[PDB]
Write a protein that binds this ligand. Structure first.
Ligand SMILES: [Cl-]
Ligand SMILES: [Cl-]
Lengths: 668, 668
């Protein structure tokens, strides 16, 4: 009922003498490998449930509740896949049909191999932009085809060569992703914080907006990429806005307005409506119907999707020769794609709670990309707005994605010619209106401003670095800056001078309470950070500052007054009332409860502190050293003198009692 | 004499109620600026003693003891400056005389502006190699001079253009260093640990060895630089070893042998010899005498220094136009130079102990470089072997460097033509033999292997990165890797399950002592690392593993048995002896004494842990939360329910007593 202890003062020697070490258990790397190579049925089942996750949940799928939600979610996400897929195919400098292949082959496989049950794997704009840049670089727009035969200008051969470049790029991306996954690369997903994921995603949103502005405005500018891409693209659009198409801009604007109104209607009418209406289906149908009936393309020169072929291309081995240079690109796409997909998988897991294993995620994506590259496709990561829509509608399982893949297959097989008249402005408006859920992530700035300025710094710096400095070189910069923020937290700790609560052993801050009173002749210093090379000199200077006791000025003042082995040396100064007034502190207790670790530089600084405080005549005691800290002290030869083991104490109260009893004994 | 406390169980509400907050002191940035703009005589003196350090020590120079040591040290360091200066001028693709200017103008100024009193500022090989590469790139060896007039081949105009390129490079380097120094860039010197500094210095030693191998062997290969420079240079030397000069190799080898024998003699005879003999003076004199008497250059084609001009060139403004491209180089030289000089300044300070302020170091070097760039010089950092020699001989003050500068001035003014016959092999041997003190730093591998494997990792990785990947891109990699080692220490902590020492409040590890016995029904978990985004899921998994209590399997087992707001929910399972045997733990105490900080991800994981443990029916208590940790918990909305403030406890014993009294009360 009451805190009552009556024990002797537990310094380091006393506690070590009262204890006996317990025998260690066997540790053998050979034994670690031993059980691994022994086959057991349970681990065999676990290997399968780890590599083929569909074997786990699909036989246990619940038909009572999940069926309706998955059907609705699949319908909505496929209705979103179609225009997003076509537009993202347009973004990749490839014929629009290959977007449909990109949205069918890798979707079905992720159902077999993937982990997250709320994630939609379709083409993504930034990866599509990278592939389009790769295609442009290898085969430029102004390329002379040796075939001839046909009249002036040709598009089929150039597009075929571009899609072959994409086939090599995505095959290399899939191979790299599979190799990373099998080499246990899923641990790196732990370094993508929520602040670093949300900033990255919002930067990607801005990039997509500025990329599709070109098609929204009907302008025919360049495809500036790399560093400073967003600003270059937006200024190129702004300069060439004089060549805008009034018809295309008008149809795009009315499509965007209808989409925004429908989204607002769905949000307001969430409760009474059993399921959100497929608004994008109405938008696409109305756009293609208006374009076909009014013949906008032949009338006023409106950009159109084109002719979407009707049929499944037979599996085809991709070129591996292009791997010569596409390698530097493939690696970037595989990094960016993995980062984005694991970011949203972690977001969905935090929202709901399930297995989000990144290793099997990378394995599944690597298998999908390669097993798709052989099927006339391109790089496929997780889509962002579509994933948000799928999770919002009520998506429960991955069968929703399979339904979307089935509907896209139906579009490829039967209704591929209905969208041959669909204007590109409709696709641009559909893509832009779906970024709204991603631009809503800008609300984190006030919340993080109120919560923690370091998290706000991470958010702002990843947003800026992934906006103005590309999206592939922005992720690495953001991760490094997050790690340096951790280092900064370790390099600017809270230096607290402690004080003793009366009649108790509670030691808390002296500047933040009135009961807390300092123990006469004793000053306690606390640092809530490890003492290592980065914050060692800072720790020593703060110790000299806060406690008000620095050996340098004390020794100098002894010298000025004179003008007119044992750890410490007693003061030999002749009795004189010329010392500047002070509290004649005899011991300085250092709090090591919060010090996690110490390296060689920290140990050297600690030895220097002890030596220079003992030269003046002031003891230094270490309170609450952890086992690891004592190991670092012993290994770095801090305890060469066995008498330095008496400085350590188990707690602050033990150190204070030791100092008091030492002073009492010294008087006698 | 004995640890005796009798206080009530201090949970968070009780302690907070017993305390009252103390009024904060005024904090105003305006007040910070206020006193800065007010002029006081003491701060005026301090500004001067900070910018002109010579005003501090020079009037207080002690003539009794320092004079002889400084004279000897200055003689030795100047005798080392001469051949090192000439060889490093040879390394920079500039006439050898400019090495003499590089060793006079910036040395005298550092005496006025520098801080460290044991540091020698002369030309350095790697900086000289960078400048020589800059000169080669801007003006190649095969350049057509429009002057004509003279016969085939010309060297004066090409060398003048090269030295003008060096004049722009070093002026930009000095300007950049001064700007960094005045912008308070000396804080970055805290991130250069000893393991990193020593690895960097040994890599520089290997680079210098492989660079001067070319002159030692008499081979006339290329000047490969950049990435993979050491291997390229050494293979180029090895392939062309068939064109070696027997005479030059022989004289270089005998010079090296004489130098090594003299060094061994000096080391063995340290006590009886009043002062080390100037061995390099004998070596240079003998080499030039033999070359002049035997006429090696005209006889057997031995490489020679050349003609060293006799006179001081009048101050001359350097070109600023070359700053167009030399900028990318100048910045690299200023970084590498500052890193090296602050590394050895810190090493000397740790050896002795004095002011090593890096800001004034950068200011002094920036002033020296620019004020020399205007005097026909090049980039000048701290020399390594020469600094070691100066500190070893007994150098006390910077007047030793001034003596070396004076002797170099005498060489320039009077005896500049004595060394016109000195072979380059002698210079190469002299430079190589002085690296011995730097190759002795390889002994850190066993010491760091015994002491700490992470420090050994830092040492090895900085050595490899600064050896095989250049010296300018190696420093940044080493610093980043050191910071990631800190992050790794935070991501692999020691998960310790604690136990109670009998009849006392000491809680220590349960697997490392026999007295330590676990409190029945209570399991204590300790992590000596902050709970943040990097090690949050790892912490939760370790909590489930070590303590043997995971809510997932417990709930699953309740479900299997069934087959046959308040923070926690009591167990409703009907009384059945089908639970797998356990210790029916009722509370799990988490130790937060060693947790420095928590971010949003850590708080979310902690809330999830508390919720999922309360669903089963097991309390979770937090023991020893710091003020900063409680602030992070409160800001991140962990304490939205006021009942969660009762979970916090001041110490482990308080939490154990609270759990015991709660269990006792529950029975009644
Ligand atoms: Cl998107
Ligand atoms: Cl050197």
């Amino acid at each position: 009922q009451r805190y009552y202890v009556e024990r002797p003062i537990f310094s380091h020697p006393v506690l070590q003498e009262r204890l006996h070490k317990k025998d260690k258990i066997s540790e053998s790397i050979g034994d670690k490998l031993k059980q691994a190579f022994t086959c057991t049925p349970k681990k065999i089942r676990n290997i399968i449930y780890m590599f083929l996750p569909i074997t786990k949940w699909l036989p246990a799928y619940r038909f009572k509740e999940y069926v309706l939600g998955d059907i609705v979610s699949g319908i909505s996400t496929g209705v979103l896949q179609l225009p997003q897929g076509l537009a993202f195919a347009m973004l990749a400098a490839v014929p629009p049909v290959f977007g449909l292949y990109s949205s069918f082959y890798p979707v079905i496989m992720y159902c077999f191999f993937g982990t997250s049950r709320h994630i939609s794997i379709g083409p993504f704009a930034v990866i599509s932009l990278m592939i389009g840049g790769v295609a442009v670089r290898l085969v430029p727009d102004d390329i002379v085809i040796p075939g001839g035969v046909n009249a002036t200008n040709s598009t089929e051969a150039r597009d075929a060569l571009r899609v072959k470049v994409a086939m090599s790029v995505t095959l290399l991306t899939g191979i790299i992703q599979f190799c990373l996954g099998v080499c246990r690369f899923g641990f790196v997903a732990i370094y993508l914080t929520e602040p670093l994921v949300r900033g990255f995603t919002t930067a990607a949103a801005v990039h997509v907006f500025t990329s599709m502005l070109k098609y929204l405005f009907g302008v025919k500018t360049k495809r500036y990429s790399g560093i400073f891409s967003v600003v270059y693209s937006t200024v190129a659009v702004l300069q060439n806005v004089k060549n805008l198409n009034v018809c295309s801009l008008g149809v795009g604007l009315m499509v965007f307005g209808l989409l925004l109104g429908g989204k607002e209607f769905n949000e307001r009418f969430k409760e009474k409506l059993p399921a959100p209406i497929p608004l994008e289906f109405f938008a696409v149908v109305m756009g293609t119907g208006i374009s076909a009936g009014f013949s906008l393309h032949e009338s006023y020169n409106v950009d159109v999707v084109g002719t979407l072929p009707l049929g499944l291309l037979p599996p085809a081995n991709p070129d591996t020769s292009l791997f010569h240079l596409v390698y530097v690109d493939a690696i970037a796409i595989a990094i960016v794609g993995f980062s984005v997909t694991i970011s949203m998988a972690k977001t969905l897991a935090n929202k709901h709670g399930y297995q989000v294993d990144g290793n099997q995620e990378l394995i599944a994506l690597g298998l999908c990309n390669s097993t798709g590259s052989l099927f006339q496709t391109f790089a496929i990561s997780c889509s962002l707005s579509r994933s948000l829509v799928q999770e919002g509608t009520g998506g429960k399982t991955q069968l929703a994605g399979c339904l979307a893949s089935l509907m896209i297959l139906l579009v490829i097989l039967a209704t591929g010619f209905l969208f041959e008249s669909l204007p590109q402005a409709v696709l641009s408006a559909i893509v832009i209106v779906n970024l709204k859920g991603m631009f809503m992530q800008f609300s984190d700035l006030p919340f993080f401003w109120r919560t923690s300025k370091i998290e706000l710094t991470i958010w702002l710096t990843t947003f800026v670095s992934s906006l103005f400095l590309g999206l592939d070189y922005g992720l690495i910069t953001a991760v490094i800056i997050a790690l340096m923020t951790v280092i900064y937290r370790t390099q600017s700790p809270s230096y607290i001078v402690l004080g003793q609560l009366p009649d108790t052993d509670v030691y808390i801050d002296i500047d933040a309470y009135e009961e807390v009173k300092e123990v006469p002749g004793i000053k306690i210093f606390q640092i809530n950070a490890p003492i290592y090379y980065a914050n060692s000199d800072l720790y020593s200077s703060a110790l000299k500052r806060k406690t008000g006791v620095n050996p340098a000025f004390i020794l100098g003042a002894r010298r000025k007054a004179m003008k007119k082995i044992v750890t410490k040396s007693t003061l030999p100064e002749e009795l004189q009332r010329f010392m500047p007034p002070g509290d004649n502190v005899h011991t300085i207790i250092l709090d090591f409860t919060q010090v996690n670790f110490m390296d060689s530089v920290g140990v050297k600084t600690l030895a220097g502190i002890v030596k220079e405080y003992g030269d003046v005549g002031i003891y230094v005691y270490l309170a609450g050293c952890s086992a690891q800290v004592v190991s670092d002290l012993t290994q770095n030869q801090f305890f060469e003198n066995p008498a330095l083991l008496d400085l350590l104490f188990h707690s602050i109260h033990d150190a204070v009692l030791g100092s008091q009893v030492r002073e009492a004994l010294a008087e006698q």
